[PDB]
Design a binder for this molecule. Structure first.
Ligand SMILES: Nc1ncnc2c1ncn2[C@@H]1O[C@H](COP(=O)(O)OP(=O)(O)O)[C@@H](O)[C@H]1O
Ligand SMILES: Nc1ncnc2c1ncn2[C@@H]1O[C@H](COP(=O)(O)OP(=O)(O)O)[C@@H](O)[C@H]1O
Ligand SMILES: O=P(O)(O)OC[C@@]1(O)O[C@@H](CO)[C@@H](O)[C@@H]1O
Lengths: 302, 298
């Protein structure tokens, strides 16, 4: 690791996982041995996916998440590095496994059977976050996971910001992606709050407009609540009460939507960190995420 | 060194294992209990077991330079296996697989990534000084090329006294017509339950009586049949059988057949009878079925 200029990086706190994806002509029968058509090892995870996109956009970025020493972590570290992501803030754990998932895709009907990673690895704690010099970062994005601990991390960034002049204040964003009650306390933190379509649907909201009007009461004074909704584009709502919307930019053919939301989050964060408006950031968010949907992986998203 | 090692020729795979409560339904999302990496492959699994049994052993298979091969090599060295005979390849990736182990019954479902890696050729085998080995086990794979390797061991044996002849074994694990030419080679022939079932045989007894005509004069045909144990049949025509040694809880059957093969090979290489080797084969394979991996077999 070397010298990182002050207020230059965008930090994404969250999960990194090794996704082993196998494409099969038919789903295997229990206790059987089949040969896959093609097999890939990928670095997944929301915060991890957003780092890749932030690097491709030309932003210096850093990742913070838990990892255990081993060959799985070595592959993920090398893949982060291949995408120019800074891994100096990784929380190296003595106990637990680096997350790894097995995804079996059936080529005959497109069905995906996923065997998710185990829960052995501890998440990043408030004490792990407390040891980080925050002066390198201009923006800190937190993927909602272990909410009680993340609230303390968010409280530490507020304490830091109270001592800085407006030009050296660290902007903050949070993602509520899974419909879990523990995560809803995170709505009240951050300057930008991303809520997923899946969370909105689980709370009874049938559109991005309903979600934003129904959830704005949970965000802190002055924050912007954002809700992406696939082919219906994305909406945003700020303190002025004006619902903002961007149409989607659907690709010529949809090839791969995995990490589309993470591409949208990184692109909105990037656009706002460059001083652009919320309306311009929604549009850019939809443009990059839309381009990504017509490509396999993140190469060529530009 | 002279006639001290047991050589296993075959595949070496990186097994990415997930241990689950129950096998997933298609299109479902489950959380595994745990995960681990194991050095797999039939011949490679048999080397692990042969080392744990106290046998000096060597592995021969194709590997491509890289981090996957480095992990597997370090594991072969951690398990005391000799890797000096590895056939290093300039193209193709090292094989890997996703193994889903069901903790409730020990079933193992494997999704194998069989790469563009070339197999060990008769030319690669021709460069090996065979004097170090007392036994050579060949996992059936590229049959045309392996028949030439087997023909070379016969030529070598013709020029040696009975005491210094290299004993040979073969495994026919996959139901492929190309592999059935290998029945006519080796002193011991292992045929899998899956192969026997594919040929219409509903038991180890039917398989052995129906397939003995394919083995060479004097050979022993062996057929393991999971919870039903294993059978063997030699030139005397007497069907031998061993009951299984099931653990109260069967938690991992990944590499059980390879444990049985290594244990039968080991017992026979120590001068024990076919009957004693079948029982030991089931004893060790049975103990393995109640443990995750190969630690605690001895
Ligand atoms: N089918 C699609 N066509 C065009 N753009 C899409 C499509 N799916 C996703 N996007 C883009 O990605 C953004 C986030 O998509 P979304 O489906 O809500 O997230 P995710 O699929 O990762 O859960 C959308 O706002 C849109 O800009
Ligand atoms: N369920 C089981 N209970 C007891 N022993 C077993 C069981 N499964 C396998 N074994 C032992 O392993 C040997 C090989 O069995 P096999 O079904 O071919 O395993 P694999 O599925 O790994 O190929 C059997 O002969 C037996 O000794
Ligand atoms: O459980 P089995 O049948 O004894 O064998 C396990 C096995 O060697 O199969 C290989 C694939 O052919 C490896 O993935 C695996 O370790």
């Amino acid at each position: 690791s070397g010298l990182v200029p002050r207020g230059s990086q965008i930090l994404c706190v969250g999960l990194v996982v090794l996704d082993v994806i196998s494409l099969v002509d038919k789903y295997p029968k229990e206790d059987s041995e089949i040969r896959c058509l093609s097999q890939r090892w990928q670095r997944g995870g929301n915060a991890s996916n957003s780092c890749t996109v932030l690097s491709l956009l030309g932003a210096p970025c850093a990742f913070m998440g838990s990892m255990a020493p081993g060959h799985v972590a070595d592959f993920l570290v090398a893949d982060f590095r291949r995408r120019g992501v800074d891994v100096s803030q990784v929380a190296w754990q003595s106990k637990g496994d680096t997350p790894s998932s097995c995804c079996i895709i059936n080529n005959s009907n497109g069905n995906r059977t996923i065997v998710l990673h185990d829960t052995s690895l501890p998440d990043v704690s408030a004490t792990d976050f407390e040891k980080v010099d925050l002066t390198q970062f201009k923006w800190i994005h937190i993927e909602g996971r272990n909410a009680s601990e993340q609230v303390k991390m968010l409280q530490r960034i507020d304490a830091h910001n109270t001592r800085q002049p407006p030009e050296q204040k660290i902007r903050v964003s949070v993602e509520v992606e899974k419909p879990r009650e523990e995560l809803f306390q995170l709505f009240g933190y951050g300057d930008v709050v991303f809520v997923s379509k899946d969370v909105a649907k689980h709370l009874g909201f049938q559109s991005a407009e309903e979600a934003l009007r129904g959830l704005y009461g949970r965000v802190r004074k002055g924050a912007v609540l954002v809700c992406a909704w696939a082919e219906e584009g994305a909406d945003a709502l700020g303190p002025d009460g004006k619902l903002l919307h961007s149409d989607a930019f659907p690709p010529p053919r949809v090839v791969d939507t995995l990490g589309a939301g993470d591409t949208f989050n990184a692109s909105v964060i990037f656009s706002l960190s460059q001083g652009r408006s919320v309306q311009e950031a929604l549009r850019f968010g939809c443009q990059v995420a839309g381009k990504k949907c017509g490509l396999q992986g993140f190469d060529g998203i530009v």
